[PDB]
Amino acid sequence: HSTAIGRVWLSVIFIFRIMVLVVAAESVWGDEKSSFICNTLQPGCNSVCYDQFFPISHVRLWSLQLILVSTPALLVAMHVAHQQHIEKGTLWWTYVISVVFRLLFEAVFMYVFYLLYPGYAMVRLVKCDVYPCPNTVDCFVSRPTEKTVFTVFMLAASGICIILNVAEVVYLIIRAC
Amino acid sequence: HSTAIGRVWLSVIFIFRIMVLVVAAESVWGDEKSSFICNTLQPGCNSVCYDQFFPISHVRLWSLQLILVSTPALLVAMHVAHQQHIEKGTLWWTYVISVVFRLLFEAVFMYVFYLLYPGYAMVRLVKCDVYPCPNTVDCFVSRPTEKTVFTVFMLAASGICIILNVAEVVYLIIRAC
Amino acid sequence: HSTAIGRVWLSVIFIFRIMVLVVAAESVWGDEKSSFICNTLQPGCNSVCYDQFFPISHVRLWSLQLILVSTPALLVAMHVAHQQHIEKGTLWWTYVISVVFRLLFEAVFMYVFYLLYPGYAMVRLVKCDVYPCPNTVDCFVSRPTEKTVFTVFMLAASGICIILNVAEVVYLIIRAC
Amino acid sequence: HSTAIGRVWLSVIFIFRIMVLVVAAESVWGDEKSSFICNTLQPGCNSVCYDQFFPISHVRLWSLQLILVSTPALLVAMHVAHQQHIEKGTLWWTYVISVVFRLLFEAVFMYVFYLLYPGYAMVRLVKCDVYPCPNTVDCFVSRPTEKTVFTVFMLAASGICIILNVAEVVYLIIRAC
Amino acid sequence: HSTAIGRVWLSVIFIFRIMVLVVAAESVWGDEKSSFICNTLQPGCNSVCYDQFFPISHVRLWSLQLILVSTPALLVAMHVAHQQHIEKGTLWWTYVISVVFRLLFEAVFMYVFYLLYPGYAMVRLVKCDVYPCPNTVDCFVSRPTEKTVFTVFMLAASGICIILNVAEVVYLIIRAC
Amino acid sequence: HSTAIGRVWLSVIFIFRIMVLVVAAESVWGDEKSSFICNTLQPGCNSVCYDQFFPISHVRLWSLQLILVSTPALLVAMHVAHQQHIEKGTLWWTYVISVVFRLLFEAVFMYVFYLLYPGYAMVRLVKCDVYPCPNTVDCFVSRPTEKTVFTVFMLAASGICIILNVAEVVYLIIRAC
């Protein structure tokens, strides 16, 4: 019932994103806070500086994005199961709405990533002047390069997903006409 | 036998809550106590201050809420299985009672969350004057911003669940009349 | 073959107890010993004080109670399978004996909990004077409030199980007469 | 083909032992070495004293005992599967030999437990004079009381298994005559 | 439909690589950063030196390589499932393209491994002069020999995979002619 | 198609080895490096001494041995599946070659174990004079006795496997004649 190009490629990219996120969360981001250390004797400086520079981790943002993108499909599948229960083209329009919602969810999460972390690259040293840290202190980020590489992978996959969703919408519209 | 709107949407929101809780418990709240540090030399100040400011963690409250909400459905399913065994509209009234009980459980857990943690936001610094901490000491909370974001997500999902349960009850009453 | 009220409610409460124990063991009681600290310079004081005040953890007692309660049912199921193998009301009396044994196991574990930990509430500070700790030292318990809440939940569930088992026995006796 | 009393009771006790061992290994014995501390400034004293007083942990001995007891049954099942393949009372004698081997394995492991750890109870303080510890030093054992309780449980279960195996052998001999 | 030699040998080598990577990631590379220590009093020297000498771990590179190699096959299987859905030699050419893409992915990952880590062997001591480390400091790598052995295993397996893919392409071309 | 004695006994011993390795890896060898401490103030001495005395852990060697022994059987099973696909005594000779390869893999791993760790027993104290450790320092090995016991178990099982493989080859040759 769905288009040929859409489902297969979207599922493959989604599985790739899930695998990459699993690897990165299991390994790369495990000690992002425990090994985060600042050059100071001020108690509590490490925690406040980490909170200031990492309001929410990249892994958590990616997990939330994947969940939000998935629940359209779960809702559509539940509605299809309910239709089957009733049995014992509004479905097409519902599928279009779900695809559109997935596209907006991806775009919103990309914009949030841009707002929170301008730039894909992660730096080794950050300057933190948040209370109670006196003046400005230097803090050091765990595995900036590996995190940058995984961030690039996730952003490229998300952009590919966005383009694929747009192409799927265009193809479905052409099918309608 | 049940209403069209209710089961699908409630199940989707419940699965979303489960996924969010799994992510947050696995990652965000893991080091809520180990990295909780106060600015003092008093032994035992950290533990008593953490206990005073976090009588029970947000993750544990959400887990208890999900279990309490779930066991109505488990009890109804067990009763249905027992009815099937007997085979080898009291069921409708039992379903209404279970939905009502789920609604009250959600409302009670929301009220408990309001009582224990007034306000969704978590602060970086807390003032603790609990024995044996001398005078008032400053203590620093791990990942206040990420915890605030996840708390907002869970509260919004719980409110949506409450509204959906109320709408389901109203729809079932309209069906009765 | 069994009573209507008994099996469903007992299974629901048992599953609730299992879920609560899983959550508490995974989260609440993980650092009960590592974060247990006393105010002293005496080596080995922490370990002996923890052993004196926690001969066996609440989680371990609950796990042992659940296993002991379960093995009646496992033995009855194995005997039923053996009867099926023989095929290729002594069963009723065996079921009554198993229910009675479960009731006594619950009562004995409740009495043991009363003996070891008089009172549901857990205190923040304990006074320990066990060798080699000099005079009396103060030791601080991790998460007393959350542990108290979970203890209350488990005790209420166990009491409900005891009452349900007694009611099941009475109903079965009435069926006999 | 087997006796009525034997298989069911032996399987129930074996499952009980497995559950108890799982709980104890997951929880009780996790920090047996990390929290093992001696009252000395000598480097390496903790490790040598722990090795001297715990050549092999109770959990590891129980795991080895369970594996050794199990592999008779696994070998018998594999031989039965091979007989089925051949199809596409030597079996009785093989079953007797397997039961006898299980009985000797249980007895040997009980004797090893007696040799290594005379007495079920675990003490809080041990006196260690192993090189390079100077003179005699005091070392403190983690959770002696809980370990003693679990040791008592495992020893009682093992003794019940031994008695059950002996009774099964006697019953099978009576069947032969 | 596929060649005799290719699928079986490629699957066996892929499973071998997966098993080796699982073992190494679980055990060898767990403490690559936590036990990475430099001989200095400069705060943050350890983290920057580890980032400089390990931009991305060997385990993460191998995981990414395996995922990238796998997704060709997953995409081909999804396309085959879509063809089956349509049912309710373009496939040959698609299989050739997927095999070619796997070969290039293996070659690119081998070249990346050569660029990042010239030489299979890992050294015990590295010289790090990255800010803020003053002058040049010595840092010590955890388990260089075991990591070297596992690196040799993975590189040999990857080379065997490359040769097997080339042979499969040649055999398929010969089949075409 | 295979011999009666071979498959059953080899599978039983292989499963026993897998279980023992799982237990030992989960428990005994977990802190082989973290608790490895030398008597010195030299930074990096612990890591270089551990690398010098443990180039690769016993658990990792056993895991590699089991994987290498297994992949013959996996390759043979894959070839059998391919033969089944073709359907939709070269197999005997392939089975002999696989058994021979397993025997050589076991022998080679035994020889490697002899080379790396002469003697089954593990000592408490080792003398390390590897740079940058000044002169000779004493280092202490975690759980030498338990590791020795598990090493003896694994070596005995491996020797039994070697003898069983040789006997299987002899029996198959006798079958050929």
Side-chain angles (χ1 to χ4, degrees):
Chain A
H1 189 94
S2 177
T3 60
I5 152 255
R7 40 152 90 82
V8 159
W9 277 92
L10 267 308
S11 24
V12 170
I13 304 307
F14 194 77
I15 295 170
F16 166 85
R17 285 203 281 171
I18 287 191
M19 279 152 130
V20 172
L21 183 46
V22 163
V23 162
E26 187 95 1
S27 75
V28 190
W29 268 267
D31 62 357
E32 70 185 308
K33 188 167 186 296
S34 50
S35 65
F36 187 88
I37 59 109
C38 304
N39 186 359
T40 179
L41 282 173
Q42 183 69 49
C45 193
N46 286 340
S47 74
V48 295
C49 294
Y50 172 86
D51 187 60
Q52 170 69 23
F53 277 92
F54 300 100
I56 177 162
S57 64
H58 300 240
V59 153
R60 253 76 89 196
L61 275 172
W62 292 322
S63 304
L64 278 178
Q65 179 185 359
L66 289 181
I67 294 173
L68 261 294
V69 156
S70 76
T71 70
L74 206 29
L75 179 64
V76 152
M78 239 62 94
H79 180 237
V80 165
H82 182 264
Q83 164 58 18
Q84 171 191 350
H85 200 237
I86 286 182
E87 170 252 304
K88 317 244 66 182
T90 62
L91 297 313
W92 180 95
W93 214 288
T94 296
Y95 173 86
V96 195
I97 291 269
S98 82
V99 168
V100 160
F101 254 79
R102 292 202 313 268
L103 165 64
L104 281 101
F105 284 172
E106 292 266 311
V108 167
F109 268 97
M110 197 85 120
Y111 179 75
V112 167
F113 226 92
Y114 162 79
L115 279 193
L116 261 54
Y117 303 104
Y120 60 101
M122 206 162 300
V123 299
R124 289 169 174 164
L125 196 155
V126 287
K127 309 282 197 184
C128 165
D129 63 49
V130 166
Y131 190 81
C133 305
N135 318 305
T136 297
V137 301
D138 307 320
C139 309
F140 303 88
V141 174
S142 171
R143 316 169 186 265
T145 314
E146 201 164 20
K147 282 172 184 169
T148 291
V149 170
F150 275 91
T151 283
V152 166
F153 261 98
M154 297 295 290
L155 291 173
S158 199
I160 287 176
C161 267
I162 284 183
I163 298 187
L164 267 187
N165 281 307
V166 161
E168 215 286 332
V169 169
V170 175
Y171 200 119
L172 215 44
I173 291 326
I174 294 322
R175 272 275 274 232
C177 269
Chain B
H1 189 94
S2 177
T3 60
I5 152 255
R7 40 152 90 82
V8 159
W9 277 92
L10 267 308
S11 24
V12 170
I13 304 307
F14 194 77
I15 295 170
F16 166 85
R17 285 203 281 171
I18 287 191
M19 279 152 130
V20 172
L21 183 46
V22 163
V23 162
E26 187 95 1
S27 75
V28 190
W29 268 267
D31 62 357
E32 70 185 308
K33 188 167 186 296
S34 50
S35 65
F36 187 88
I37 59 109
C38 304
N39 186 359
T40 179
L41 282 173
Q42 183 69 49
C45 193
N46 286 340
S47 74
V48 295
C49 294
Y50 172 86
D51 187 60
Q52 170 69 23
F53 277 92
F54 300 100
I56 177 162
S57 64
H58 300 240
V59 153
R60 253 76 89 196
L61 275 172
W62 292 322
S63 304
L64 278 178
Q65 179 185 359
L66 289 181
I67 294 173
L68 261 294
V69 156
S70 76
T71 70
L74 206 29
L75 179 64
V76 152
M78 239 62 94
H79 180 237
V80 165
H82 182 264
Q83 164 58 18
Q84 171 191 350
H85 200 237
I86 286 182
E87 170 252 304
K88 317 244 66 182
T90 62
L91 297 313
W92 180 95
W93 214 288
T94 296
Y95 173 86
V96 195
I97 291 269
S98 82
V99 168
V100 160
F101 254 79
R102 292 202 313 268
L103 165 64
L104 281 101
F105 284 172
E106 292 266 311
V108 167
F109 268 97
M110 197 85 120
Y111 179 75
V112 167
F113 226 92
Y114 162 79
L115 279 193
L116 261 54
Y117 303 104
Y120 60 101
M122 206 162 300
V123 299
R124 289 169 174 164
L125 196 155
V126 287
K127 309 282 197 184
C128 165
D129 63 49
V130 166
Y131 190 81
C133 305
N135 318 305
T136 297
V137 301
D138 307 320
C139 309
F140 303 88
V141 174
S142 171
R143 316 169 186 265
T145 314
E146 201 164 20
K147 282 172 184 169
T148 290
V149 170
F150 275 91
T151 283
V152 166
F153 261 98
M154 297 295 290
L155 291 173
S158 199
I160 287 176
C161 267
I162 284 183
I163 298 187
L164 267 187
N165 281 307
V166 161
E168 215 286 332
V169 169
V170 175
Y171 200 119
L172 215 44
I173 291 326
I174 294 322
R175 272 275 274 232
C177 269
Chain C
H1 189 94
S2 177
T3 60
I5 152 255
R7 40 152 90 82
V8 159
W9 277 92
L10 267 308
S11 24
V12 170
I13 304 307
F14 194 77
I15 295 170
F16 166 85
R17 285 203 281 171
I18 287 191
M19 279 152 130
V20 172
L21 183 46
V22 163
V23 162
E26 187 95 1
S27 75
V28 189
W29 268 267
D31 62 357
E32 70 185 308
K33 188 167 186 296
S34 50
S35 65
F36 187 88
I37 59 109
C38 304
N39 186 359
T40 179
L41 282 173
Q42 183 69 49
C45 193
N46 286 340
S47 74
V48 295
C49 294
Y50 172 86
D51 187 60
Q52 170 69 23
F53 277 92
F54 300 100
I56 177 162
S57 64
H58 300 240
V59 153
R60 253 76 89 196
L61 275 172
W62 292 322
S63 304
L64 278 178
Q65 179 185 359
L66 289 181
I67 293 173
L68 261 294
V69 156
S70 76
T71 70
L74 206 29
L75 179 64
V76 152
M78 239 62 94
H79 180 237
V80 165
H82 182 264
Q83 164 58 18
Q84 171 191 350
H85 200 237
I86 286 182
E87 170 252 304
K88 317 244 66 182
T90 62
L91 297 313
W92 180 95
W93 214 288
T94 296
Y95 173 86
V96 195
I97 291 269
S98 82
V99 168
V100 160
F101 254 79
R102 292 202 313 268
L103 165 64
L104 281 101
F105 284 172
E106 292 266 311
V108 167
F109 268 97
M110 197 85 120
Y111 179 75
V112 167
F113 226 92
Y114 162 79
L115 279 193
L116 261 54
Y117 303 104
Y120 60 101
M122 206 162 300
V123 299
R124 289 169 174 164
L125 196 155
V126 287
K127 309 282 197 184
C128 165
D129 63 49
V130 166
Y131 190 81
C133 305
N135 318 305
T136 297
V137 301
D138 307 320
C139 309
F140 303 88
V141 174
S142 171
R143 316 169 186 265
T145 314
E146 201 164 20
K147 282 172 184 169
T148 291
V149 170
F150 275 91
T151 283
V152 166
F153 261 98
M154 297 295 290
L155 291 173
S158 199
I160 287 176
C161 267
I162 284 183
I163 298 187
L164 267 187
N165 281 307
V166 160
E168 215 286 332
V169 169
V170 175
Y171 200 119
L172 215 44
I173 291 326
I174 294 322
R175 272 275 274 232
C177 269
Chain D
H1 189 94
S2 177
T3 60
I5 152 255
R7 40 152 90 82
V8 159
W9 277 92
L10 267 308
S11 24
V12 170
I13 304 307
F14 194 77
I15 295 170
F16 166 85
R17 285 203 281 171
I18 287 191
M19 279 152 130
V20 172
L21 183 46
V22 163
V23 162
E26 187 95 1
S27 75
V28 189
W29 268 267
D31 62 357
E32 70 185 308
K33 188 167 186 296
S34 50
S35 65
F36 187 88
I37 59 109
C38 304
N39 186 359
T40 179
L41 282 173
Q42 183 69 50
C45 193
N46 286 340
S47 74
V48 295
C49 294
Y50 172 86
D51 187 60
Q52 170 69 23
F53 277 92
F54 300 100
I56 177 162
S57 64
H58 300 240
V59 153
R60 253 76 89 196
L61 275 172
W62 292 322
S63 304
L64 278 178
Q65 179 185 359
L66 289 181
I67 294 173
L68 261 294
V69 156
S70 76
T71 70
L74 206 29
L75 179 64
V76 152
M78 239 62 94
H79 180 237
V80 165
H82 182 264
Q83 164 58 18
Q84 171 191 350
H85 200 237
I86 286 182
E87 170 252 304
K88 317 244 66 182
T90 62
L91 297 313
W92 180 95
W93 214 288
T94 296
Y95 173 86
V96 195
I97 291 269
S98 82
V99 168
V100 160
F101 254 79
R102 292 202 313 268
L103 165 64
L104 281 101
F105 284 172
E106 292 265 311
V108 167
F109 268 97
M110 197 85 120
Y111 179 75
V112 167
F113 226 92
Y114 162 79
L115 279 193
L116 261 54
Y117 303 104
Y120 60 101
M122 206 162 300
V123 299
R124 289 169 174 164
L125 196 155
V126 287
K127 309 282 197 184
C128 165
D129 63 49
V130 166
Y131 190 81
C133 305
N135 318 305
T136 297
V137 301
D138 307 320
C139 309
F140 303 88
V141 174
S142 171
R143 316 169 186 265
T145 314
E146 201 164 20
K147 282 172 184 169
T148 291
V149 170
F150 275 91
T151 283
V152 166
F153 261 98
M154 297 295 290
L155 291 173
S158 200
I160 287 176
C161 267
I162 284 183
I163 298 187
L164 267 187
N165 281 307
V166 161
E168 215 286 332
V169 169
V170 175
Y171 200 119
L172 215 44
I173 291 326
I174 294 322
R175 272 275 274 232
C177 269
Chain E
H1 189 94
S2 177
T3 60
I5 152 255
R7 40 152 90 82
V8 159
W9 277 92
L10 267 308
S11 24
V12 170
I13 304 307
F14 194 77
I15 295 170
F16 166 85
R17 285 203 281 171
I18 287 191
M19 279 152 130
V20 172
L21 183 46
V22 163
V23 162
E26 187 95 1
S27 75
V28 189
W29 268 267
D31 62 357
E32 70 185 308
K33 188 167 186 296
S34 50
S35 65
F36 187 88
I37 59 109
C38 304
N39 186 359
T40 179
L41 282 173
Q42 183 69 49
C45 193
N46 286 340
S47 74
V48 295
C49 294
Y50 172 86
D51 187 60
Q52 170 69 23
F53 277 92
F54 300 100
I56 177 162
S57 64
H58 300 240
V59 153
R60 253 76 89 196
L61 275 172
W62 292 322
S63 304
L64 278 178
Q65 179 185 359
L66 289 181
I67 293 173
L68 261 294
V69 156
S70 76
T71 70
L74 206 29
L75 179 64
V76 152
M78 239 62 94
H79 180 237
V80 165
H82 182 264
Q83 164 58 18
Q84 171 191 350
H85 200 237
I86 286 182
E87 170 252 304
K88 317 244 66 182
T90 62
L91 297 313
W92 180 95
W93 214 288
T94 296
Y95 173 86
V96 195
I97 291 269
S98 82
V99 168
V100 160
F101 254 79
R102 292 202 313 268
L103 165 64
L104 281 101
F105 284 172
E106 292 266 311
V108 167
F109 268 97
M110 197 85 120
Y111 179 75
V112 167
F113 226 92
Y114 162 79
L115 279 193
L116 261 54
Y117 303 104
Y120 60 101
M122 206 162 300
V123 299
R124 289 169 174 164
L125 196 155
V126 287
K127 309 282 197 184
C128 165
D129 63 49
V130 166
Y131 190 81
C133 305
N135 318 305
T136 297
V137 301
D138 307 320
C139 309
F140 303 88
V141 174
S142 171
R143 316 169 186 265
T145 314
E146 201 164 20
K147 282 172 184 169
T148 291
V149 170
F150 275 91
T151 283
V152 166
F153 261 98
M154 297 295 290
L155 291 173
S158 199
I160 287 176
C161 267
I162 284 183
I163 298 187
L164 267 187
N165 281 307
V166 160
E168 215 286 332
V169 169
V170 175
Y171 200 119
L172 215 44
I173 291 326
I174 294 322
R175 272 275 274 232
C177 269
Chain F
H1 189 94
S2 177
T3 60
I5 152 255
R7 40 152 90 82
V8 159
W9 277 92
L10 267 308
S11 24
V12 170
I13 304 307
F14 194 77
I15 295 170
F16 166 85
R17 285 203 281 171
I18 287 191
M19 279 152 130
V20 172
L21 183 46
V22 163
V23 162
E26 187 95 1
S27 75
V28 189
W29 268 267
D31 62 357
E32 70 185 308
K33 188 167 186 296
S34 50
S35 65
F36 187 88
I37 59 109
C38 304
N39 186 0
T40 179
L41 282 173
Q42 183 69 50
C45 193
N46 286 340
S47 74
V48 295
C49 294
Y50 172 86
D51 187 60
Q52 170 69 23
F53 277 92
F54 300 100
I56 177 162
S57 64
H58 300 240
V59 153
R60 253 76 89 196
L61 275 172
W62 292 322
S63 304
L64 278 178
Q65 179 185 359
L66 289 181
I67 294 173
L68 261 294
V69 156
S70 76
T71 70
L74 206 29
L75 179 64
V76 152
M78 239 62 94
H79 180 237
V80 165
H82 182 264
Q83 164 58 18
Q84 171 191 350
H85 200 237
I86 286 182
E87 170 252 304
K88 317 244 66 182
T90 62
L91 297 313
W92 180 95
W93 214 288
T94 296
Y95 173 86
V96 195
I97 291 269
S98 82
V99 168
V100 160
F101 254 79
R102 292 202 313 268
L103 165 64
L104 281 101
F105 284 172
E106 292 265 311
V108 167
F109 268 97
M110 197 85 120
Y111 179 75
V112 167
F113 226 92
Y114 162 79
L115 279 193
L116 261 54
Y117 303 104
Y120 60 101
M122 206 162 300
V123 299
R124 289 169 174 164
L125 196 155
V126 287
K127 309 282 197 184
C128 165
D129 63 49
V130 166
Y131 190 81
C133 305
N135 318 305
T136 297
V137 301
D138 307 320
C139 309
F140 303 88
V141 174
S142 171
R143 316 169 186 265
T145 314
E146 201 164 20
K147 282 172 184 169
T148 291
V149 170
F150 275 91
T151 283
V152 166
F153 261 98
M154 297 295 290
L155 291 173
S158 200
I160 287 176
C161 267
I162 284 183
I163 298 187
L164 267 187
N165 281 307
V166 161
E168 215 286 332
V169 169
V170 175
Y171 200 119
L172 215 44
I173 291 326
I174 294 322
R175 272 275 274 232
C177 269

